[PDB]
Amino acid sequence: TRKKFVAGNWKMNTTLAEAKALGAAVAKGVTDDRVTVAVFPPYPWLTAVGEVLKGSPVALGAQDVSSEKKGAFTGEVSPAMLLETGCKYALIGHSERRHIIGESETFINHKVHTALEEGLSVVLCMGETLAERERGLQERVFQRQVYAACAGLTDEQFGRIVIAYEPVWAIGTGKVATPEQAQEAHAFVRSKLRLLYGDKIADSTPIVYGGSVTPDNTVGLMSQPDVDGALVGGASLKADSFLAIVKAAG
Amino acid sequence: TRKKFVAGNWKMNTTLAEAKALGAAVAKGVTDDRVTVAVFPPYPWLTAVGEVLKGSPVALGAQDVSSEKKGAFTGEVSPAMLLETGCKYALIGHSERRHIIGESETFINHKVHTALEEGLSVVLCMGETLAERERGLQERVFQRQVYAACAGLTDEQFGRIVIAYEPVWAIGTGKVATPEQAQEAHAFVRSKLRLLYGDKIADSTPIVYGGSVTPDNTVGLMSQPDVDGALVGGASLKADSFLAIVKAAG
Ligand SMILES: [Ca+2]
Ligand SMILES: [Ca+2]
Ligand code: NA
Ligand code: NA
Ligand code: NA
Ligand code: NA
Incomplete structure (x- = not known):
């Protein structure tokens, strides 16, 4: 049982x-x-x-x-x-x-190590674009993103990692992933951790959902077995909507 | 007579x-x-x-x-x-x-406009690498950088522009441009302003020198006709060395 994680961006x-x-x-x-x-x-x-x-x-x-x-x-x-x-x-x-600024996997991997070495915990964001999704490339992308960002991490360092799945088509568009779609992505990400980093790391690492999360859709998302919380965008700018999502993760 | 400008980065x-x-x-x-x-x-x-x-x-x-x-x-x-x-x-x-992070001319040009539109003044940094210098490309680079960054600026907007010439070979290397080398670069940059934007803008815009500036070399740099001050790096982290450079610009 993973402790839920709700972050306001x-x-x-x-x-x-x-x-x-x-x-x-x-x-x-x-x-x-x-x-x-x-x-x-x-x-x-x-x-x-x-x-x-x-x-x-x-x-x-x-x-x-x-x-x-x-x-x-x-x-x-x-x-x-x-x-x-x-x-x-x-x-x-x-x-x-x-995608807008243009940060590379090399840069991201270096940031993850540097942040962890200096004593921060890390919320690693990942996810596929509409073009990638429509061409059924999401699993290729998830694997590339997770394994490139985590390259060289020790098992111990994973203790301070949270992964946030944000489909890019879901950011700022008002088009949330259905809970079932979110769950499919989170389950795949967890499998990638399991196959390369083992059961302990896969089952302990929170994977949170990002993208058009609102107080109206959080309950369905929160109930999914591999969804461990939320990375909240626009709804985090009002305290009551953010707190509604926090309380739903309880 | 341009008012001198001393900035501590x-x-x-x-x-x-x-x-x-x-x-x-x-x-x-x-x-x-x-x-x-x-x-x-x-x-x-x-x-x-x-x-x-x-x-x-x-x-x-x-x-x-x-x-x-x-x-x-x-x-x-x-x-x-x-x-x-x-x-x-x-x-x-x-x-x-x-060069390290990877910001493009498109991004830089957009930043200049956005900063000016919102009410900031801008210190536009430019300059050539060792490889560019050794191949005599510095004038091509200066022209590309200045004209791309300033693309679309009004004459009035130039009133809030300072240009900083930093040769990349001079940053953090302890290898300052000789005052005569700095002066050559500043004179060329001022000519580029003059030919495209006119005399008023060329003669009014401060062009400041950056790169391994120290209290020991500032006087020679400050005396050059097209050098209007300094963008100070490492020496800006100690108040006395920074102030020594400020007082030399007086
Ligand atoms: Ca294990
Ligand atoms: Ca004129
Ligand atoms: Na990089
Ligand atoms: Na977000
Ligand atoms: Na850009
Ligand atoms: Na500097």
Whole structure:
């Protein structure tokens, strides 16, 4: 039985005041530790949101992280910086970064190692595009993404890995995967872990669903055997809709 | 006579305490407004450094900025966010982002427009690699970089542009361009502005030198007719070395 995991990806949204308010409202609403809950503000607000999360079970996370630990990497944010702001997690490989910004598997694999080595936990994002789906390539893509990102990880390092399945066709489109479609993808990802990394790792690693998650569809998704929670996009920007999803994971 | 411009690029360095201390020490040392001075902390420390710069002439800047104004761009930081932290400037096209991260001219051109439209001023970084230099391609590169980044800018928008020439061979290598080499590059860049954008823009736009600038070499660089200041890397991490360069631009 995997502890459920509900993460709120605020993306490139919120003013400083809105960030503080959203963080504080989510913190106040998370009144037990039965579900792992984390929120992911944009970099400039991390120390401010970290402050309002103090005294609550809610973790702080960053939306990206450098592949390097320090130094001459203009514009990049290091694991050390994120840890100092209060982060426990970093998202790596989000579809917007893979497909719009253009991050490679080499870069993603380096980020995973660097984040873990420095003491962060990692939410590794993966998933297929509409074009890939329509050509039945989703299993090829899932295998490439999972095995490339995890290349070189120790068994122990997997203890700090969460995988987020986000079909790209489901992001910001209002077209959620049916729970049955989500379940099929999660089951395949778990099988890929099992065949290469073994039963303990496959059965212990949370695989969470991302993509057009809303309070109206979360129950069906949450009930699926290989779905361990949610990576929430737009619905994470309102505290009540985010908390509704958290409470559904309980 | 162009007002000189001295910018401190802290890159992926400093703890929160160190950032506050460095900002405060630079602020205290800048006791007139004869030189435009700006410091560029990593994103998470921007509000903290903005605070310690209050009441001084020193401006705040960011090391990068999104090409988009808001929304579903995980990991990206918007002009609106930067402005709220107190930023007046954003660096765009730094060599580490062009060559290590992999930012394209399309992305850079979009960033320049987006930053300017939202109210930021822009430090556009450009410059050639060792391979390009050795093959005498530097003028081809300078033209491509300047004309691609500025494509579509209005004459009025140029009022908020600074160009930084950083030869890539000079970054972090301890091999500064001789002042005469810097001057040749700056003169060529200014000619490219003149031939396409006219005399007013060419003669008014600050072109600053970046790359292994140190208090020991700044005077020779500062004296060159087409050098209008410095984009300072490693030397910006100590307040006294940074201030020495600021005072030399006076
Ligand atoms: Ca096993
Ligand atoms: Ca003219
Ligand atoms: Na890379
Ligand atoms: Na998301
Ligand atoms: Na792009
Ligand atoms: Na620099």
